[PDB]
């Protein structure tokens, strides 16, 4: 439709898993950071060349077929191919900034091969930081302080908050009644609670909430923290009588993965290629400084990113889970 | 009793609640049935009166006086009034929907409470029946073990020489399981015949089950709220 | 008796997976689509140069040998070789019509590997649809709006409809209670009694002892993944889209789709009146079960507990 | 038998699909443990003809 | 506003008496629909004024 | 701090009417349109 795009389409007429445009520095750094960890491998880190606009669709499927009597009657109105619920992403900047003291710098520089170790260390410290900030982080507020927000809850809006304030009716936070708007503030799961066990929970959740299309899919994952998983699998091992059941770690007929710093009282069921992060093409600005006022060598780096779930009707999350007995 | 007595009246409360809910349900059902069966006959009578008025007016030519005036305006009045008569069906169904939802809710609550009471009673009974009585079996099994431990008792050689404890335990397990399988439950006991039995005995158990699990309940409640906020524009 | 079949058969008087009538373009596209997914690999897709003909019998066996008193006065009766019930079929049209918007088109056009991604996406999106319409659909209406029929129920007739319509036997939905029951208080055991009764009562015997019989049921009550533990001594599988409350026992080659050769019309229009580019494609297909033997299905079940 | 009939209820199994031991074996293990504890802590007297 | 109030009251009173009615809710309903027909020109007079 | 602005500013350490980012076609059309009328000449039109 545009000049180059019209040419490419006319040419269409007459690895395919990740997206590249041109070899630059920020793309290379992002690719390195992805290859570092393992969880970033199973996710889409997309470079975009715009400050605000439309998102692309990945793993979206909609039934497109019908039959119409074109012979003397109505016409054929085609259905849309990529029409999602709501799609408007807004990329924003976040920046890291640190310093090394002269003493520690000298101690490290004494031995050989220190630059490579420092590079690998900062890359590893950065990737896990992306994850931790993404899964937490209700809202973004300028001049973020790390006094009362140690879990990094103020950098940018995360996937969970995206689900919370962008597409409600896909979350579960209370047991209610037609007269009792809050019959139960917390979803008790136990012998006497509102469920039998986590299996029935994830089962009826994946039955009711998510759409019938993705419901029948060869790929679904139940992202859950570490406290809840261990709380479920501990009473199994604490018995007297088969140990393979600790290797696969399936719950509710669905494979389970665990990511660090995930909130303990919630779990999100979705396909692992549906959520993604977008980053501006060339915004990785990095500067050094060697001020002696505090005898420290400091550095600043800034990058423009934005987390985004592609199709909100893909997965759903349950929040405020509490296991007990409730006699 | 005397230890589950306070945990018993809740069964009666849930029972009364579900009974009132089912009563309201059948009342709504008979109401809508009566309304529809009356609407049919009223529409038929209106059609008959219309046919008769039309043919009588055709008989009298294109002129009329002192008659066919009150009759026609009465007929058109009835035709205007049957509109809300037919309209009441939708508000009645909308009222019945939330009623059936609450019916399923109170049903599942009563079922849960009954199961909890039965479980508590069974646990207490098994504990109190194992701790106090059945003590001669213990000394019998102790004597049997003391006998089987002797070296001139195991007919099996070095292979498969299972410990006598496991053997006597399997023996008692089999002899007890056979009895527990061949037997049955009789209702000749005051507390067990009083309130216990099967799950429940009423009309609504699974037929509707629109709410059921809390997630489906939430979806249904959201849809009902949308429908009600939409209908609030009209009557 | 056409002048080609006599010549081809006379030369006989002096390999079973792909057919390949002639290397056309619609056949190449169909082969690509069937190679894309995995469930389409085990199934049989074939072309045909006409409509309302005979069913090409693939995967049909039987007993042909016998003995007769040739000297007493009787004569050898040549039992049929391809004996089937209602060997007729048809073919219908189905069309995919969809538009891409300009903005999104620019977005896809920015990155690399554009045409390949578009082709793979559209191929997958229609290949999944073929299946999702296979196990469903009970009519051939002329409107077929996708609003009041979420799953494809108005496009064509499906296998679970051909069974339910042509042969009223080979399907049980009533024991006499209306809907069958399963559980301790029901009419059967958990699943073994029911599946055994099904594989012993309805499906014909000389297809029972086959090394490929498979029970097919959805993800509930449990590409394509196979459960290691056989339910009725038969391996269990799950197909992506399926009415969960039902199941069918049959082989995996007994099902098939017939696509009418040289019927694939693809056109693209660019109407700037709206800001979109439309694409229409029309093909001609019909689903068909090879043999009504070697297959039965149970429809209305409800696992649970009863009095 | 009453304990089994109670445990057969669907809203009984605390464990999910993994390790969903049958109620019969569970109550049997319970009674076996509670009986062997008694048989081990006790001793045999000698006041019997 | 008075017409709306009368309509609400008639509707709830008719819902109370079930799907049967006699000797009442007949003159009231036709009077209400008469008023509903007559308010048309009442609102129409604004444009000519 | 993009790798182009630092290089362009570092060379500075060692004309205000038209901007002309790059000679594209939309820019040529815009220049033609602004040259057509007279009020558009005194005003400032810029690309971004």
UniProtKB/Swiss-Prot annotation, chain A:
<keyword id="KW-0946">Virion</keyword>
<dbReference type="Pfam" id="PF05125">
    <property type="entry name" value="Phage_cap_P2"/>
</dbReference>
<keyword id="KW-0167">Capsid protein</keyword>
<protein>
    <recommendedName>
        <fullName>Capsid proteins</fullName>
    </recommendedName>
</protein>
<dbReference type="GO" id="GO:0019028">
    <property type="term" value="C:viral capsid"/>
</dbReference>
<dbReference type="InterPro" id="IPR006441">
    <property type="entry name" value="Phage_P2_GpN"/>
</dbReference>
<keyword id="KW-0426">Late protein</keyword>
<feature type="propeptide">
    <location>
        <begin position="1"/>
        <end position="9"/>
    </location>
</feature>
<comment type="similarity">
    <text>Belongs to the P2-like viruses major capsid protein family.</text>
</comment>
<comment type="function">
    <text>P2 proheads and capsids consist primarily of N*, a 36.7 kDa protein and two minor components, H1 (39 kDa) and H2 (38.6 kDa).</text>
</comment>
Curated annotation (Swiss-Prot), chain B:
<protein>
    <recommendedName>
        <fullName>Glycoprotein 3</fullName>
    </recommendedName>
</protein>
<keyword id="KW-0426">Late protein</keyword>
<comment type="function">
    <text>Although P4 acquires its capsid proteins from helper phages such as P2, it possesses the ability to assemble capsids that are only one-third the size of the helper's capsid. The sid protein is responsible for the assembly of P4-sized shells. It forms a P4-specific scaffold with icosahedral symmetry on the outside of the procapsid-like particles.</text>
</comment>
